């Protein structure tokens, strides 16, 4: 039941022209800070963000004068909250979690964690959004062709 009872927000893909437009996303139930413009990156390794990006020597910190980095992450194999923490530790300005199946948007919830891993939940700051498989696939196709994917996030509705 209540399969469509999701806190939806609009995002805008501003480039490339082929996929530019407004899309629905679901803001995660954690770490909500406003509008932010950034550029999307899909890493070649560690694509589910379940291990530290430091182990791969991967950083998403943007150089001065460039757009902040929104990292595109695949759903699966670990909690959404851990993905957001790990992307945050790697310097990403936001995380977009692409659903692994084509379905209505879902709300990324916070798990009940062991005492040894409870404190990071309080320390998540970066905006986190779940996007559809269809949009994730569209962004990946654009990036693999060499296009720059820019995006405006809006969490004012949250």
């Amino acid at each position: 039941g209540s399969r469509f009872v999701v806190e939806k927000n609009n995002l805008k893909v501003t480039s490339p022209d082929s996929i530019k437009g407004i899309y629905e996303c679901a803001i995660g139930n954690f770490g909500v800070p406003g509008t932010l413009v950034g550029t999307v990156v899909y890493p070649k390794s560690n694509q589910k963000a379940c291990k530290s990006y430091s182990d791969f020597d991967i950083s998403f910190k943007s150089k001065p004068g460039r757009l902040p980095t929104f990292v595109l992450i695949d759903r699966g194999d670990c909690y959404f909250t851990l993905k957001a923490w790990i992307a945050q530790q790697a310097g990403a300005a936001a995380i977009l979690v692409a659903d692994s199946k084509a379905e209505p948007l879902i709300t990324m919830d916070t798990p009940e964690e062991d005492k040894s891993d409870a404190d990071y939940l309080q320390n998540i700051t970066i905006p986190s959004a779940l996007i559809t498989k269809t949009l994730g696939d569209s962004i990946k196709s654009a990036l693999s062709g060499g296009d720059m994917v820019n995006m405006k996030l809006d969490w004012t509705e949250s």
């Binding site: 009872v5 209505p104 879902i106 709300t107």
Partner: peptide, 5 residues
């Protein structure tokens, strides 16, 4: 529609 993973 809430999921942890």
């Amino acid at each position: 529609s809430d999921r942890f993973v």
